[PDB]
């Protein structure tokens, strides 16, 4: 159980919503006069009016360094190659760290499981999580998300972020009252590695699978730059919904690293129909799911064209005198 | 230690080539006055005249079988839809279980910590490894890699079967004396899920990983049908050349399931020059080496933008006045 | 008008259907006892009973070469790289060439403003139609079409030909009593080159346009080797149901000049609900179609933000106070 | 001829350097204290300084308006959703328009052929050229470009814009005495519709042409948000040195209307040892370059595949007794 396998459970267990902390994000935005637009500006002037942060961009960092905040000067250098929506995410982090230290440290004393190094991850994860909540207001968000009917892009545009942080937020919308969509977030690479799993209740990858070559969000890379849908169903017979969308790092440079994710947001079948992703699909028709699985040797399926495992609590049928276009049968 | 590993492992000791039965392979395409050139109807022939075996081409066979015998009335029924390499390779898959059994047996028998169905599995193994010798005698296609400086397309068209084909059997050149490139060869999916690995000597993805998104490998599904190659430095230094390309299987239908998978074929980087697939190419320039892993929890790496995951035998470092390009630093 | 264009327009004048034509190849078909399945061989079997032409498989041909036939010796040679259902068609192509040389030349001799050589390009042409018409005789291939709703790799599967062929045919089922869907088949590159038009009736690109990046069958490459499918609307309303998809040719090796094409099957959305294509797809939902043009300046579109250049019969509107993101307002 | 193909060509006489505007844009940049980074503010301030322009970020705009000036309350309003680098290429627009009026006037007057609207076009080219002279100040630019080896990402992330930005101010490097790589810059979509070209000398695509398949511009959106590269020679004998990327509008919804484009930049084969997007590539081998044409019509290659149209000042040569790879021999 490393680390950050360790705040992904502390995550999940709070079904993907710290409402304390939530609610302070947005209660912050409204006392200090926020309008959505244009953050960046308006947070550097809140960490200088409120905690006497002086907040500079930097084209002198390090090409590597999104921030750097220097505690005993009280100032918050900023990478000059972050578009607004990047810089308000830095600077909200930082304020995170200063301005709610001891809410986070109390949110974090509810898991007393937690590891020596846990406790710092997840400080950097509650961190990160008000500066969502900041950036995306849980009512405005919520209403936008709901006009829009879910458009990732046109919420993105609306508030000045990108993808993934859209993402991020929508799948954590379980604030008692005013609920959305329940969703299940994943990050995934070329190799099928998922790097992030956060979910509103229990799906079948909130923690642990996922390596079907049949489920939509390997195939976005197939497809870079566009989003891709899916009406999928698991061997259990439970049916869902899942959009996923490549996103690339801009800069580096022909030669140098790049960074290319798949982020992915699933929901139950019933809930499809609330979603711009559904236009044009129908969705009462069990003849046109996907059957997809959790991953080879999980997977119970017996004529899967795709198997590259064998499913590993089941019965290995060996004949010499037959070949077929089903492995492992 | 399922029993297809335990096959993997059979395979892996003996460097993936199998001198009694290549041999075996040969002496019968040659004595039985074999010319490569529609094996397909030869192979019919010889099973008449040599095995009192009667091949049809039946298209009343389920979808998905590829071919049936019957040993009753000793009838191979192969599927209408093979191509005629394919059909060539399910009858010399036949042949090898009927006219070779012995052979296969007393190979098998060497291998003594093989599990039960290890057994069945390996047998299936020796079977397709002969049909693969068979259709490319070992000379003759010894001779044709050098001729064609290994252009898997250009010896596919000569001997009249596949991509994957062509680079297993490319994979087993390792007859004393007239040795080919050491290869290492792996089939993969849009998850990373590698199903087959087979090496001619001591690889880093000969038994374990493979799991880098860097590596061109996983990369093949974003250019489908499209030859991929990459020069790659593991983090020990030792580079490698990689040549990979998707295979898909025709038909099945708009609705059907389908089959994907990704063929790649790795040697040292010192052979390389020796493949047509170097030309355009700088082989003498370490800067322009991309640098994969083997996996991110097993990668040493200290600057990979792409880490999805920390580093096994390393701490989790957390900064909370600062923020990086490079998660897991 | 080039020879070329004039052919496609003697096709185009014909519906694209040649009764006589093909009621000789289905006739032929019958009258020799053709089977489907393994057509090269029967075929080869056909030119010698019925020809005194010998068919030979020869791999001392010029690489570009995929048959030649020697009249003074009647000796047809056919390429050994290509497929079963490559071979037939070649055959079926000198068969039409030999022995259907009087009803071919009528057939010329009905449109008398052909130039001289498209007068030659013309008996190809119809030595080409013979030959899909004799592969895929009418009845049995129309059956075939209405039992599968128009799975094209199901159709090839069955009769063991390639993508394109199928297509061709399906675009060409316009006999009197027993017609299929009405289509219109295009063929394109990745610069938008339309190599092939043919259609059983008036379609907006059957002769001329279709330079509109919005299109479907331009996407197709973006997505290679898998089936694209759009539901499309042009500037005049009428709307159309587009299905597309890559073909490549094998072999040639990593240097050799490649061959890649789009072949685009369209229909009027009408008859979208009989093909397996229309699958998933609400088409009764005019908010869902794709509104694209025929090129960006003979579409008289006014808010397209893809417009390439203005409309010819358009007025130009040019602002200095204000920008936007729909060029050529 | 009309009137954007004459702005087109005016550019196309100048070498694409407008040696009086770009010094002004310069000249302005530096007596107003302009520093790279965050120009949209500084932009702003100035135009309030020096104009009594009053420049609001308006999210209530429409949806497709990117600026509006106001003359009579001198009010300029710029779209919340265009980043930092696009909201002062807007500014600049603006201030070409006003405070540059009379010295875009003067050079409009020198092409007296214009026709009425092709002046109007003129001016807006003009502005545009200015606001990227001056968001890219020349020397500073030039000298950026050559310590960067021409990497277009490096020199976006330092300026603060766009691929298709970079690669517009990079094909303008013709000032006397401090020239860059003399480049042909153009902009095409899925069809092939060739929207932008601007040129420093004369290039074969520099007014017509350009929809030859196998030219890596129109392999760009096979692989989106992915550089492309590609050594070429001309049916002449010329060789070229081609890179190419994909640009894409975000927002505007999953429904919505979408902009696709692909940029290229092209240059003799001498030059492309000092672009970084040639390393690990040989250039000094003239088997390695792919044979490319400017459209089949005026291709007289004598052996391509690919040929989609016969050559226009040539016999189609039609043979009944043969078979080929090559169409339009
Ligand atoms: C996972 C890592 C370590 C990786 O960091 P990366 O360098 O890849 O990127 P990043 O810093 O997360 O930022 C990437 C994008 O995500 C956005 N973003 C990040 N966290 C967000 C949040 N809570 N809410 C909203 N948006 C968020 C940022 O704005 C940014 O958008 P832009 O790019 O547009 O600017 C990090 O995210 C992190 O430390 N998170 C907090 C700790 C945590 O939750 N760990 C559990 C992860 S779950 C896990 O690891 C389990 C997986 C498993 O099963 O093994
Ligand atoms: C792996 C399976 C079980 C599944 O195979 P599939 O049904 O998906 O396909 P397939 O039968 O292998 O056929 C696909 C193509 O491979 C070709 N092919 C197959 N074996 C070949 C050989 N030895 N030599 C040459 N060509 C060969 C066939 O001609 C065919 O070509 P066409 O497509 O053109 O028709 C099978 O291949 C098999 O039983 N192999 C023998 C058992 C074995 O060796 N297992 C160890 C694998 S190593 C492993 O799985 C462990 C790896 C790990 O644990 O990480
Ligand atoms: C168009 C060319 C010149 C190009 O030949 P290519 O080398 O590109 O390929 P090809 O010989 O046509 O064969 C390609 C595939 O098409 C199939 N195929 C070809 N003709 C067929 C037909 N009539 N019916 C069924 N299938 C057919 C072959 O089986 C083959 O399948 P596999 O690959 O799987 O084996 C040729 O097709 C031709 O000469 N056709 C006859 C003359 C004609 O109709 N000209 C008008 C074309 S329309 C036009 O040019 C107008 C476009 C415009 O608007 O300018
Ligand atoms: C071509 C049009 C009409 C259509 O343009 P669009 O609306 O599609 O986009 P756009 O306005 O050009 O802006 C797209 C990106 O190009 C950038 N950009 C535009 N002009 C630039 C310049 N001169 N220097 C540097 N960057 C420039 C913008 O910053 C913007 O960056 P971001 O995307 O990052 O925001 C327009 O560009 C224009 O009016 N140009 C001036 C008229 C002109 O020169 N016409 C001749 C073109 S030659 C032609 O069309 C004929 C070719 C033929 O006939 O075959
Ligand atoms: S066996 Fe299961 S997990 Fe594997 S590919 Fe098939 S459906 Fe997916
Ligand atoms: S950390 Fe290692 S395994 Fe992971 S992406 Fe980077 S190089 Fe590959
Ligand atoms: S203007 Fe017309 S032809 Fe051009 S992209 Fe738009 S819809 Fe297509
Ligand atoms: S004939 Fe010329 S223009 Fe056409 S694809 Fe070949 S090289 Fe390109």
Same mark, same amino acid.
């Given at each position: 159980?490393?680390?950050?396998?360790?705040?992904?459970?502390?995550?999940?267990?709070?079904?993907?919503?710290?409402?304390?902390?939530?609610? =302070?994000?947005?209660?912050?935005?409204?006392?200090?006069?926020?309008?959505?637009?244009?953050?960046?500006?308006?947070?550097?002037? $809140?960490?200088?009016?409120?905690?006497?942060? @002086?907040?500079?961009?930097?084209?002198?960092?390090?090409?590597? =360094?999104?921030?750097?905040?220097?505690?005993?000067?009280?100032?918050?250098?900023?990478?000059?190659?972050?578009?607004?929506?990047?810089?308000?995410?830095?600077?909200?982090?930082? $304020?995170?760290?200063?301005? &709610?230290?001891?809410?986070?440290?109390?949110?974090?004393?509810?898991?007393?499981?937690?590891?020596?190094?846990?406790?710092?991850?997840?400080?950097?994860?509650?961190?990160?999580?008000?500066?969502?909540?900041?950036? $995306?207001?849980?009512?405005?968000?919520?209403? =936008?998300?709901?006009?829009?009917?879910?458009?990732?892009?046109?919420?993105?545009?609306?508030?000045?972020?990108?993808?993934?942080?859209?993402?991020?937020?929508?799948?954590?919308?379980?604030?008692?009252?005013?609920?959305?969509?329940?969703?299940?977030?994943?990050?995934?690479?070329?190799?099928?590695? *998922?790097?992030?799993? &956060?979910?509103?209740?229990?799906?079948?990858? @909130?923690?642990?699978?996922? @390596?079907?070559?049949?489920?939509?969000?390997?195939?976005?890379?197939?497809?870079?730059?566009? *989003?891709?849908? &899916?009406?999928?169903?698991?061997?259990?017979?439970?049916?869902?919904?899942?959009?996923?969308?490549?996103?690339?790092?801009?800069?580096?440079?022909?030669?140098?690293?790049?960074?290319?994710?798949?982020?992915?947001?699933?929901?139950?079948?019933?809930?499809?129909?609330?979603?711009?992703?559904?236009?044009?699909?129908?969705?009462?028709?069990?003849?046109?799911?996907?059957? *997809?699985?959790?991953?080879?040797? *999980?997977?119970?399926?017996? @004529?899967?064209? &795709?198997?590259?495992?064998?499913?590993?609590?089941?019965?290995?049928?060996?004949?010499?005198?037959?070949?077929?276009?089903?492995?492992?049968?």
């Amino acid at each position: 159980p490393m680390p950050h396998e360790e705040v992904r459970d502390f995550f999940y267990d709070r079904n993907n919503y710290i409402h304390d902390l939530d609610m =302070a994000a947005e209660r912050m935005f409204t006392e200090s006069g926020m309008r959505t637009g244009g953050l960046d500006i308006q947070l550097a002037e $809140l960490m200088r009016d409120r905690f006497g942060i @002086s907040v500079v961009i930097d084209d002198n960092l390090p090409d590597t =360094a999104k921030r750097r905040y220097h505690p005993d000067t009280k100032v918050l250098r900023v990478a000059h190659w972050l578009m607004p929506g990047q810089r308000a995410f830095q600077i909200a982090t930082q $304020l995170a760290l200063v301005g &709610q230290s001891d809410l986070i440290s109390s949110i974090v004393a509810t898991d007393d499981q937690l590891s020596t190094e846990a406790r710092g991850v997840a400080r950097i994860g509650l961190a990160n999580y008000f500066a969502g909540a900041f950036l $995306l207001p849980y009512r405005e968000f919520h209403r =936008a998300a709901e006009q829009l009917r879910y458009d990732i892009d046109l919420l993105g545009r609306r508030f000045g972020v990108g993808f993934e942080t859209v993402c991020h937020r929508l799948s954590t919308l379980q604030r008692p009252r005013q609920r959305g969509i329940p969703f299940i977030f994943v990050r995934t690479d070329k190799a099928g590695n *998922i790097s992030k799993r &956060q979910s509103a209740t229990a799906f079948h990858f @909130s923690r642990v699978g996922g @390596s079907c070559p049949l489920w939509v969000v390997h195939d976005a890379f197939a497809q870079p730059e566009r *989003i891709v849908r &899916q009406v999928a169903q698991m061997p259990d017979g439970r049916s869902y919904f899942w959009v996923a969308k490549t996103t690339a790092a801009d800069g580096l440079g022909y030669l140098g690293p790049h960074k290319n994710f798949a982020v992915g947001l699933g929901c139950d079948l019933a809930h499809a129909h609330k979603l711009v992703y559904s236009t044009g699909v129908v969705l009462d028709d069990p003849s046109t799911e996907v059957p *997809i699985g959790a991953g080879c040797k *999980i997977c119970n399926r017996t @004529s899967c064209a &795709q198997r590259a495992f064998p499913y590993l609590g089941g019965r290995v049928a060996v004949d010499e005198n037959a070949g077929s276009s089903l492995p492992y049968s």
